[PDB]
RNA sequence: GGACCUGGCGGUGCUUCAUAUCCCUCUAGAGGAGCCUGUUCUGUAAUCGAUAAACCCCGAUCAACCUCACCACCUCUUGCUCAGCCUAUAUACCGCCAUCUUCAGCAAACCCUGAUGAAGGCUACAAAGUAAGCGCAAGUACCCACGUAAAGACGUUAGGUCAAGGUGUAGCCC
C-alpha cells in the first residue's frame, strides 16, 4: 500500500515549533521589524508582499502559521505500555461523547434526591472539537435532549457553568438605520445627505430641514425630469408616508439606469437622509415599509445553451 | 515538415502575395478612381488579372498553426479551439482561465 | 460527462501530483499559471508568439532531459529575459545537469535571441499530493 | 571580517545643458494578479519617498474579456465552454519630477517589475515658447 | 426439469409527491401565410459526417475563387517532409464530449450473517456493521447568507467523432 494517512507524532510537531520561532525571527530580519514584538498579523502583512497570489481560494495561498493552528488535532495513544486503557469507556468507541452523557445524567439524579436570547447551543461540527469524537447526528440531538432537560430542573450553580460552555454565542445586528450626520451650508441651513441604488440607477439626495417642497433632479424640476406620474409617485411615497409633504427641499443627482431605475434610486435616497430628520419610532416603520431597503434584483445574465437568462431553445 | 499540403498551400498563397503586394496596390490604385481616362483604367484591370492567382490575398486562409484547422480559429493565438482550451486547460495560457459569473 | 485535465478515479495505487490533481475550474482559485508574460493582457500583442515558445520549450525540455523532469516548467518572461525553472529527479549525475544547462541555455538563446537562464531545483522522487 | 576596504562607485557626471521637467509621471501597470500589483505599488511608493517624489495611487476599474468555445471537438453545439482574462490596473501619478530623477526612477522600478506585469508610461513634458511663436513676422 | 438469488419490467398495490412539472390551472408562442435557414426525398458528371429522447442555423463564432475533401479534363513521379494518403474500421483506441445528472450515489480494505450457496447487512428507548478515497456537500466566481454559473463520481447507451490532430490493425505506392 502506497497511500498511508499522514500521521504526526508529538516529536514531529515538537520540531515544527523550533522551526517557526526560527523563522519568525529571520523574517523579521528580512523586513527591518524587531523580533521580540513581531506578531503574526505582521506575519500575514510579509508573506502577502513577499509571496504575492492572487488565488480566489485563500487556503490555497502561502501560509506561515503556527503548528497547532495548522495540523489537525489527533486522538492521542489511548493506552500505556502494558496495554490496559486509561479511560474505562475506551471500548464504547466513543469514551469522550458517553463520559458527558455519564456526568450529565449523573447530575439529574441529585436534583431530585435534594428536592434566552443572544445564546444558542453548540453545533454538532463545534462539538466535535470539545471531545475530539466523530458524532452522528442522532447522537447530538441526545444531548442536547439532556442539557434542556438540565435546565428546566432547578439547577444549581455549578450545573450553570457546565451548561454555559455549550452555549456559543451570537452576535446580532440590531435592524436599524444608521442616521446620517446633519450638516449645515454656508447659509446655516440644516440638511442630510445619502446615497441611493437601484439596477444600475446611482443617486445622491440632498434633504434640507426646512423647504417648500421642492425637488431639483440633475437641476430640473422633477416634474419636468419625471413626465411619468408612476415616477413622481416613488418620490412622494416616503414623504407621504410620514405625513410631512411640503416641508423639505431636496437637490438630487442621478445617472445611470432607466426612467424607472432612476426614481428607485432616488426614492432610497432620500428615504435615508429623510431618517435623520424624523423620530426612531418612524424610522422603524419606514423600514418595515420597504423604503431603505436596497432592492438586489438585477438582470441575469445569458446562458451559453439558452435563448435568455432561463429561457430554453424550442426542444425539437 | 507542415501538418498537411493545405497548409503548404497557404504558405506559398503567402508568400507569393507578400511579392506583389506593392505591385498590385499601384495598379489598384489606378482603377481605384474617377480621375483617370477609362482607357487606362481598363489597361490596369487586364494586368492585374493577369498576376499569379496565388498574389490575391482573397485566397489566403487563417488556418491554424499546429493542426492547419481551417475553421474554429481563435486569430489572436492562431490556434483552434480545440488545441486552444488543451493549453488552457493545462494552465499554460498566462491570463486564460475559466469564467463564471 | 467533462475529460479535461481530470485524472480518473482509481483503486487508489495512482500517485498524482497537486497541478494533476486539479482540473481546469480551478486554474485560477487553487492554480496558478505555468507561463507568465503580458501577451494576453488588454492592449498587449504578440500572444500568439509567445505562445508557440512556450509549445517548443516544454518539448525541448522534456526530450533533453528525459526522465528527469518531475513536474511541469515554470515559464518566466521579464523584459527580454526568460526564466525556465524546472524540477528534477536526482537519478543523473550532476555532470551531466551543467552540460544540458550550458547546451540548452546556449542553443535557446541563439534560436530565440533572448538570454535564457535555467533553474533547476532536484528533488529525490516525484512529490505526490495524494493517490487517486 | 571579509569585506571590502574601499569601494568603486559609478561615475556620474554633471552636464552643462539644461534637464528636462516633468510636470506628471503616469504609471499604469497591468496584471491578471491583484496581489502582485499591491506588492508593487509597495515597492515603487516606498522607493519615491526615499528619493523624494510626491506620488498618488487609485485603482482604475478592471476590465475582463470573455469568450465562448464549442465543448466537443463535433458536434453539440449547445454545450460551450468560456474563458476569460483579467486584467487589473494601478496608476502611480508622480508629480515635479526631472529628467535624470525620472530615468533612474523608471529603470529601478521597471527592471523590477515582475512577469505578468505591463507598463505604460506617460510623460507630460514642459517646454517654453518657440522664438519664433514670440512675436509675429511683419 | 424443480426450488431459490439478483436485476429489469409490469395496461402492479399502498402512501407521499411533483412548482415551470405528470395533468388541470396562469402568460407568450408553434403548427395556418410569406420569407430566411437546415434536413430528408428527387435531380445532377459532381463530397463527408450528425441523424428517437441525446440529429436537424448540428461540426461551420459560417462554402463566389481559396476554403475543398467532391466531379470532368490535363500533368508530375524519392514527390514541402529521412516521403505521402480526408483510404477502410469510432465495433481497436487516446483525446474532447453528449446522456440519465433538474441524480445520489461510488468504493478500496476489513468484519459478521446465511450450516462458509448465489447473495445480504437497518430499528436511536437501537437488533452487525465500520470505513480512507471519489462525488454530492462545503469552499470559490459574479452584485452578499439568496440566486445564477461552474462543478457533477462510478457506470449506462460497443452513444458521437479515424474528416481537429495523433494513432493500432489491414490496404494503395506511375
Ligand atoms: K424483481
Ligand atoms: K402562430
Ligand atoms: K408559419
Ligand atoms: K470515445
Ligand atoms: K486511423
Ligand atoms: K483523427
Ligand atoms: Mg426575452
Ligand atoms: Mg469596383
Ligand atoms: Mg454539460
Ligand atoms: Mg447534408
Ligand atoms: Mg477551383
Ligand atoms: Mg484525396
Ligand atoms: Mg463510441
Ligand atoms: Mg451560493
Ligand atoms: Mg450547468
Ligand atoms: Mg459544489
Redesign the pocket.
Known amino acids: 500500500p502506497t497511500?498511508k494517512?499522514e500521521t504526526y507524532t508529538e516529536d514531529f510537531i515538537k520540531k515544527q515549533i523550533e522551526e517557526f520561532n526560527i523563522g519568525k525571527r529571520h523574517l523579521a530580519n528580512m523586513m527591518g521589524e524587531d523580533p521580540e514584538t513581531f506578531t503574526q498579523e505582521d506575519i500575514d502583512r510579509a508573506i502577502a508582499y513577499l509571496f504575492p497570489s492572487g488565488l480566489?481560494?485563500?487556503?490555497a495561498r502561502p501560509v506561515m502559521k503556527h503548528p497547532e493552528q495548522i495540523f489537525p488535532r489527533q486522538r492521542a495513544i489511548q493506552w500505556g505500555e502494558d496495554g490496559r486503557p486509561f479511560h474505562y469507556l475506551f471500548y464504547t468507541?466513543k469514551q469522550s461523547y458517553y463520559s458527558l452523557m455519564h456526568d450529565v445524567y449523573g447530575m439529574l439524579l441529585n436534583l431530585e434526591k435534594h428536592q434566552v436570547i443572544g445564546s444558542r447551543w453548540l453545533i454538532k461540527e463545534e462539538l466535535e472539537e470539545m471531545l475530539v469524537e466523530?458524532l452522528?447526528?442522532?447522537?447530538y440531538?441526545?444531548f442536547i435532549?439532556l442539557l434542556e432537560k438540565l435546565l428546566t430542573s432547578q439547577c444549581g450553580a455549578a450545573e450553570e457553568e457546565f451548561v454555559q460552555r455549550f452555549r456559543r454565542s451570537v452576535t446580532l445586528?440590531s435592524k436599524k438605520q444608521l442616521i446620517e450626520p446633519v450638516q449645515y451650508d454656508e447659509q446655516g441651513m440644516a440638511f442630510s445627505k445619502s446615497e441611493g441604488k437601484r439596477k444600475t440607477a446611482k443617486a445622491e439626495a440632498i434633504v434640507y430641514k426646512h423647504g417648500s417642497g421642492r425637488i431639483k433632479v440633475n437641476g430640473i424640476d422633477y416634474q419636468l425630469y419625471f413626465p411619468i406620474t408612476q415616477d413622481r409617485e416613488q418620490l412622494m411615497f416616503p414623504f407621504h408616508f410620514v405625513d410631512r409633504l411640503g416641508k423639505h427641499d431636496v437637490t438630487c443627482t442621478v445617472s445611470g439606469g432607466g426612467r424607472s431605475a432612476q426614481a428607485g434610486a432616488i426614492r432610497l435616497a432620500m428615504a435615508k437622509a429623510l431618517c435623520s430628520f424624523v423620530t426612531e419610532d418612524e424610522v422603524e416603520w419606514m423600514r418595515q415599509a420597504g423604503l431603505l431597503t436596497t432592492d438586489?434584483r438585477?438582470?441575469?445574465?445569458k446562458?451559453?445553451?439558452?435563448e435568455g437568462?432561463?429561457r430554453?431553445?424550442?426542444?425539437? | 515538415?507542415?501538418?498537411?499540403?493545405?497548409?503548404?498551400?497557404?504558405?506559398k498563397?503567402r508568400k507569393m502575395a507578400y511579392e506583389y503586394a506593392d505591385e498590385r496596390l499601384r495598379i489598384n490604385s489606378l482603377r481605384k478612381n474617377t480621375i483617370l481616362p477609362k482607357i487606362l483604367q481598363d489597361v490596369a484591370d487586364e494586368e492585374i488579372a493577369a498576376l499569379p492567382?496565388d498574389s490575391?490575398p482573397?485566397?489566403?486562409?487563417n488556418?491554424?498553426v499546429?493542426?492547419?484547422?481551417?475553421?474554429?480559429?481563435?486569430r489572436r493565438w492562431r490556434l483552434?479551439?480545440?488545441?486552444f482550451?488543451?493549453l488552457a486547460?493545462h494552465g499554460q495560457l498566462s491570463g486564460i482561465q475559466?469564467?463564471?459569473? | 460527462?467533462?475529460?479535461?485535465?481530470?485524472v480518473?478515479?482509481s483503486?487508489?495505487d495512482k500517485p498524482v501530483t497537486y497541478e494533476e490533481?486539479h482540473?481546469?475550474?480551478?486554474i485560477?482559485?487553487?492554480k496558478g499559471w505555468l507561463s507568465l508574460h503580458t501577451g494576453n493582457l488588454d492592449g498587449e500583442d504578440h500572444a500568439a508568439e509567445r505562445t508557440v515558445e512556450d509549445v517548443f520549450l516544454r518539448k525541448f525540455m522534456w526530450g533533453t532531459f528525459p526522465g528527469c523532469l518531475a513536474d511541469q516548467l515554470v515559464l518566466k518572461r521579464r523584459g527580454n529575459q526568460l526564466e525556465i525553472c524546472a524540477v528534477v529527479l536526482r537519478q543523473l549525475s550532476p555532470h551531466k545537469y551543467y552540460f544540458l544547462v550550458g547546451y540548452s541555455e546556449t542553443l535557446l538563446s541563439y534560436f530565440y535571441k533572448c538570454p535564457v537562464r535555467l533553474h533547476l531545483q532536484t528533488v529525490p522522487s516525484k512529490v505526490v499530493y495524494?493517490?487517486? | 571580517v571579509d569585506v571590502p576596504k574601499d569601494l568603486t562607485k559609478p561615475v556620474v557626471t554633471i552636464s552643462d545643458e539644461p534637464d528636462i521637467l516633468y510636470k506628471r509621471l503616469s504609471v499604469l501597470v497591468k496584471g491578471h494578479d491583484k496581489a502582485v500589483l499591491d506588492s508593487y505599488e509597495y515597492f515603487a511608493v516606498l522607493a519615491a519617498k526615499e528619493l523624494g517624489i510626491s506620488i498618488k495611487v487609485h485603482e482604475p476599474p478592471r476590465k475582463?474579456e470573455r469568450?465562448?468555445?464549442?465543448?466537443?471537438?463535433?458536434?453539440?453545439?449547445?454545450?460551450?465552454?468560456?474563458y476569460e482574462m483579467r486584467t487589473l490596473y494601478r496608476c502611480l501619478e508622480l508629480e515635479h519630477l526631472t529628467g535624470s530623477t525620472a530615468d533612474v526612477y523608471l529603470e529601478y522600478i521597471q527592471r523590477n517589475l515582475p512577469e505578468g506585469v505591463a507598463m505604460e508610461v506617460t510623460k507630460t513634458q514642459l517646454e517654453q515658447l518657440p522664438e519664433h511663436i514670440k512675436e509675429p513676422i511683419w
Open positions: 497511500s494517512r480566489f481560494e485563500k487556503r468507541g466523530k452522528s447526528d442522532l447522537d440531538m441526545q435532549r445586528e438586489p438585477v438582470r441575469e445574465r446562458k451559453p445553451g439558452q437568462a432561463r430554453k431553445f424550442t426542444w425539437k | 515538415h507542415y501538418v498537411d499540403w493545405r497548409m503548404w498551400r497557404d504558405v498563397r492567382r490575391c482573397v485566397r489566403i486562409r488556418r491554424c499546429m493542426t492547419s484547422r481551417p475553421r474554429g480559429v481563435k483552434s479551439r480545440i488545441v482550451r488543451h486547460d475559466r469564467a463564471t459569473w | 460527462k467533462n475529460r479535461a485535465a481530470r480518473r478515479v483503486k487508489g490533481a482540473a481546469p475550474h480551478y485560477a482559485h487553487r495524494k493517490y487517486l | 475582463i469568450f465562448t468555445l464549442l465543448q466537443s471537438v463535433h458536434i453539440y453545439k449547445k454545450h460551450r465552454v468560456q
